[PDB]
Design a protein around this ligand. Structure first.
Ligand SMILES: NC(=O)c1ccc[n+]([C@@H]2O[C@H](COP(=O)([O-])OP(=O)([O-])OC[C@H]3O[C@@H](n4cnc5c(N)[nH+]cnc54)[C@H](O)[C@@H]3O)[C@@H](O)[C@H]2O)c1
Ligand SMILES: NC(=O)c1ccc[n+]([C@@H]2O[C@H](COP(=O)([O-])OP(=O)([O-])OC[C@H]3O[C@@H](n4cnc5c(N)[nH+]cnc54)[C@H](O)[C@@H]3O)[C@@H](O)[C@H]2O)c1
Ligand SMILES: [Zn+2]
Ligand SMILES: [Zn+2]
Ligand SMILES: [Zn+2]
Ligand SMILES: [Zn+2]
Lengths: 374, 374
């Protein structure tokens, strides 16, 4: 039995940028008040985890990364009321404290307790539950799912259906919910509209799924890797374009294709140039562009504000605009009720021990989501 | 007595940037098919007219500027159905053709027949109705209201109430409707919200009027000219701040004053730096910022897209988002029913012949709106 005890388990530690993960024994402290210790069952490889490796997304190192996952509660600290030992759960990389001005706002979801704006790499109490070779190891986004066991704050975990298939619903922890919500909740895609989706990875395919669910008439996928096109069409793209195939800039191509600009565009890559292209390709008077891709650390884009003065709307969001703890259990219930599909996003299933091979698949352009199984 | 004839009249011709207007005789051709010739009664001096002088807003020279006005139809060309001789009218610097994809869209107002995005300085048929010293003179935004007579396309004029006071309702042709609609229609300011308004000229005061009409609890005016604060408070500002008074950047000041950022911000100046500051000061998760000011020609701003990724919305608009021909007569009717006030915007009245004194008053910081009478 493990409750109240330190657990020694396997985790993938990132000791420094631009190095493979190190799969080795860590010590996981028991949960303190209002904390939850979770036995991991499955975790996805999101491009944002790779951003930690590449230094695109700055967070304190050394670190246990991973934020898209599902598992089973091993133990709860004093005062926890929302989960119990044995519950299936999804860690929430965007917390929902329920008390801050954002949590109380009808349209806010980026809870002020988040660790994304100004990353500390700790629990809410400013300390770590992880050690490795006698050194403290940082948390990542209050989740740290590349470990057989993690500890999260109560505001960073949701209880989900006991009959949930965790090797699929882990994607509701990041990529599916982000993309789908970016379409249905943040953009509010309309029936009969034309959409353009820049980036056809796991998150961009989930944007397509949402645009199709919202009734878009046309969904134009845009990627420099034409190997991504077939799956984009399977989940709802009506046509795909590779910017490398054209002499003109792709904003001009998309404006022409849409007879004067698209209704909704999405940047789902993480490049400054594609954020400006995606804004420019939406109709100048009434178009909406949503930034989903995480930009490179501390870099500014350049744009002409006449793009906005004519009437465009530009916005971004974390986690598809979903209030995380309210939404994740409902999304899982909706998946159980066959309201959407997750299998199209899953190209590879590997044991956790093959994490580096999973990242190599993403980096090579050869995967959408790899699910790692513990 | 002038129908079908060239009219010789006085106009204010701008021959050169950064020079006084020349009040001199022009020839005004009669209206062609679907054109309307208007005897001007009153015209306001909007900062955008000054932008033509300063080269902030590029349009071909020589030009008859003026776009905020009211007058009486002198004659109509063949096929005109929406106005008749003797009707009171407001020229529409944003047309409403009723046929393009923007005019058909429920939100859109920036009709594709506009002359603002890529100014040519002509009528819709690519020609000019004005001659001066035997030389063709450009139009401005299809209106050219700094003339005793102008000719406009039918899609650029609205019939208004016969009992309208033209020396007041000319402001519905630009500055009032722009500011008021930017608050009520484009931002959709909510009851109990906190708003920040950058720039307290005629347009920014109109934004304040709209925020107060929408029920905002706090309306923070921001201007480097503290002489602007008294009138801002009269029309609904709850407090005013001068960035020059503070050691810290004003986005930090406003974030602190609003206990974490404002609900709605407005840039009503025309500076790249204040567009970014106004975005930054709205709450990072659910804030909305609206660009109203006209930026300097062809210049790009620099910004960090993490400001949007957290959840901010950034938009801009022309003419307050109003569909011009539908909306102007209704706004006049509402004014006549005392639903809003225009007198707080009018600080000076001059004859048209004193147009250069009117521009001196604007440039010195003294005026809000000067109304010129023909
Ligand atoms: N906002 C959020 O909450 C959130 C959540 C999840 C992911 N993200 C970010 O979203 C982005 C996509 O994540 P993902 O789907 O896991 O990544 P991914 O699987 O790497 O997909 C990115 C796609 O972009 C394509 N691409 C690369 N460069 C270009 C280019 N110049 N033009 C067009 N296509 C290009 C690329 O070929 C790939 O298919 C990353 O930046 C993530 O960090 C954000
Ligand atoms: N979008 C549209 O349809 C539309 C319509 C009408 C006017 N405009 C633009 O809106 C802007 C305002 O027009 P207006 O009200 O006639 O002009 P205005 O009367 O010149 O007012 C601008 C105000 O900005 C103040 N100001 C200048 N610099 C700063 C600074 N750094 N920080 C804070 N305040 C500052 C200034 O003191 C003045 O009171 C101009 O750029 C116009 O061209 C746009
Ligand atoms: Zn919160
Ligand atoms: Zn992610
Ligand atoms: Zn139109
Ligand atoms: Zn104006």
């Amino acid at each position: 039995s493990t409750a109240g005890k330190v657990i020694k388990c396997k985790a993938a530690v990132l000791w420094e940028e631009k190095k493979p993960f190190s799969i080795e024994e860590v010590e996981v402290a028991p949960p303190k008040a209002h904390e939850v210790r979770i036995k991991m069952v499955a975790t996805g490889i999101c491009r944002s985890d790779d951003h930690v490796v590449s230094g695109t997304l700055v967070t304190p190192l050394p670190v246990i990364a991973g934020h898209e996952a599902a598992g089973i509660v091993e133990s709860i600290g004093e005062g926890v009321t929302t989960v119990r030992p044995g519950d299936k759960v999804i860690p929430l990389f965007t917390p929902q404290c329920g008390k801050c001005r954002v949590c109380k706002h009808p349209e806010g979801n980026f809870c002020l307790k988040n660790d994304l704006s100004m990353p500390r790499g700790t629990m809410q109490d400013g300390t770590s539950r992880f050690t490795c070779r006698g050194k403290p190891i940082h948390h990542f986004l209050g989740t740290s799912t590349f470990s057989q066991y993690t500890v999260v704050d109560e505001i960073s975990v949701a209880k989900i259906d006991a009959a949930s298939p965790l090797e699929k619903v882990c994607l509701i922890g990041c990529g599916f919910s982000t993309g789908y919500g970016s379409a249905v909740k943040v953009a509010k895609v309309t029936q009969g509209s034309t959409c353009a989706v820049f980036g056809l990875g796991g998150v961009g395919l989930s944007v397509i799924m949402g645009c199709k669910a919202a009734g878009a008439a046309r969904i134009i996928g845009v990627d420099i890797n034409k190997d991504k096109f077939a799956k984009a069409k399977e989940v709802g793209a009506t046509e795909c374009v590779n910017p490398q195939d054209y002499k003109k800039p792709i904003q001009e191509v998309l404006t022409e294709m849409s007879n004067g600009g698209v209704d909704f565009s999405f940047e789902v890559i993480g490049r400054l140039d594609t954020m400006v292209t995606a804004l420019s390709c939406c109709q100048e008077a009434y178009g909406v562009s949503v930034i989903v891709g995480v930009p490179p650390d501390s870099q500014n884009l350049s744009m002409n504000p006449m793009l906005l003065l004519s009437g465009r709307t530009w916005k971004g969001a974390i986690f598809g605009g979903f209030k995380s703890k309210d939404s994740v259990p409902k999304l899982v219930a909706d998946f159980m009720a066959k309201k959407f599909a997750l299998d199209p996003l899953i190209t590879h299933v590997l044991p956790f021990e093959k994490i580096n091979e999973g990242f190599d698949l993403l980096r090579s352009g050869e995967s959408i989501r790899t699910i790692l199984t513990f």
